[PDB]
Amino acid sequence: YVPLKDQRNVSMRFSNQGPLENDLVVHVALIAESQRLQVFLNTYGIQTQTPQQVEPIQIWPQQELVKAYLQLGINEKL
Amino acid sequence: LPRASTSKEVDASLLSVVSFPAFAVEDSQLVELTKQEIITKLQGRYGCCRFLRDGYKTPKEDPNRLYYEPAELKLFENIECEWPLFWTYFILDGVFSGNAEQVQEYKEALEAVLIKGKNGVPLLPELYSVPPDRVDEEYQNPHTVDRVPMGKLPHMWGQSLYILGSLMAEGFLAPGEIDPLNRRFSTVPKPDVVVQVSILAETEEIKTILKDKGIYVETIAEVYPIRVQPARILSHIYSSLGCNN
Numbered sequence: 001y002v003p004l005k006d007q008r009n010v011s012m013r014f015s016n017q018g019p020l021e022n023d024l025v026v027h028v029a030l031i032a033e034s035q036r037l038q039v040f041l042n043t044y045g046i047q048t049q050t051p052q053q054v055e056p057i058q059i060w061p062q063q064e065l066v067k068a069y070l071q072l073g074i075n076e077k078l
Numbered sequence: 079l080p081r082a083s084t085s086k087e088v089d090a091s092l093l094s095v096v097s098f099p100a101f102a103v104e105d106s107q108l109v110e111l112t113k114q115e116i117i118t119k120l121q122g123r124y125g126c127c128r129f130l131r132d133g134y135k136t137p138k139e140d141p142n143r144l145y146y147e148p149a150e151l152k153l154f155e156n157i158e159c160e161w162p163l164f165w166t167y168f169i170l171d172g173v174f175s176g177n178a179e180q181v182q183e184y185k186e187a188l189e190a191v192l193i194k195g196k197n198g199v200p201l202l203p204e205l206y207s208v209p210p211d212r213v214d215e216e217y218q219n220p221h222t223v224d225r226v227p228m229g230k231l232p233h234m235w236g237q238s239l240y241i242l243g244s245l246m247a248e249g250f251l252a253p254g255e256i257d258p259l260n261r262r263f264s265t266v267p268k269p270d271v272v273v274q275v276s277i278l279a280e281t282e283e284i285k286t287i288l289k290d291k292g293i294y295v296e297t298i299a300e301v302y303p304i305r306v307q308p309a310r311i312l313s314h315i316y317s318s319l320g321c322n323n
Contacts, residue, residue, distance in 0.1 A: 055254060 031059070079108050080115070082129070089129045090120055090164045097171040101261045116164075123221050124191045124206050125160030132158055135229055137210035156220045157213065159205040162191060163236050166202070170243040174253060175262070181247060188240075193227065202236040204229045278306075 007014045017023055032038035032048040041048050051059060082089035092112060096103050103109055120126045133139045133146070133154040165188055172180040195201045206225035208216060216223050245251060253262065277295045279285040288295050298306065 053260070056252065 079103070080112060086129050088116060088119060090116060090126055090161070091128065092116070093164055093167050093171070097167055098174055101264045104264065106265050120164075122160055124225060125162040126164045127158040128161055128164075130158070131155065135159055135205060135207055137208070137213070152217075156216055157208050159207050160225065161205060162188065162202060163233075163239075165191075166236055166240045166243065170239065170246065173243065173247050185247075193231070200237070200240070201231060202233045202240060203227045203231045204233055 002010065007019055009016050015021070015024070030048045031054070032041065032050050035050055038048050038050050079092075081087060082092055093116065094100075096109055096112065116126075131150060131154050133150070135141075136154065136157060136159075138153050139146075165184065169181055169184040169188070172178070172184060191203075193201050193203055205228065207228040208223060208225055212223045246253070254260070277288075277293070279288055279295050279297050282297065285295060285297055
């Protein structure tokens with residue numbers, strides 16, 4: 001239980017902007033697929049990056065996290 | 079590019095421009111040409127020289143005197159000492175893009191010229207000096223007489239670059255992390271660009287004349303949202319950037 005004056009920076013209950021406020025800013029990342037598509041977009045001023053230029057980072061589908069979560073919580077005795 | 083300056087036929091310092099720091103060069107054929115030229119002209123036995131006819135740290139010249147007298151006939155020929163900095167440049171240059179065997183060759187070449195000091199750690203000498211006695215033989219047999227270390231050797235620049243190159247070669251760190259700006263792709267050709275040109279008439283008479291021959295344009299009027307003015311106004315506008323009182 002928290003008072004009405006304390007509900008400012010709690011986790012999973014209220015946002016940092018206050019209870020009666022909604023002004024969240026979300027981030028987006030632009031990533032292309034192929035060199036032809038990215039150069040075609042750049043010809044029109046659109047900026048996008050090929051997947052081969054983000055080598056330190058990796059992009060994986062949703063099933064990888066599903067199988068990783070499935071791996072967790074295994075016990076042999078029971 | 080081929081010559082460092084109008085008085086110097088070649089300088090070894092052009093390697094830094096055309097290697098790891100500040101890639102600013104195109105037409106890689108010239109890169110290969112200058113690399114081959116520096117290899118064939120400035121390579122020595124235990125190092126390489128900065129440029130032809132330098133007298134720095136020589137058994138002649140009366141080192142306590144400056145402002146060289148114009149008498150460098152043969153007193154500074156083929157006795158240029160050495161500089162392993164440009165040698166330790168080559169290992170980084172090779173390991174940078176795609177070269178591996180040259181990296182091994184340069185590493186094995188430079189491991190022979192190292193000096194072990196306190197605690198048994200690598201140390202890079204500044205230069206090796208020709209002995210003051212064996213000078214006549216070198217004039218007839220260049221790059222044959224052994225040399226001796228001389229001068230200061232807490233060379234932080236060379237040691238730092240060498241240890242950075244060794245860490246790079248060990249594979250712990252990727253080449254794309256040192257330069258997040260991606261300066262490694264300066265040799266990628268650009269096909270072509272398309273230029274857009276707009277035509278406008280100053281007065282109604284000019285527009286009528288252009289339309290007479292079949293050319294359709296517009297005057298300075300009718301495009302009120304946009305404006306046109308000479309570039310001297312633009313320069314006078316630029317004359318106010320970064321002004322502090």
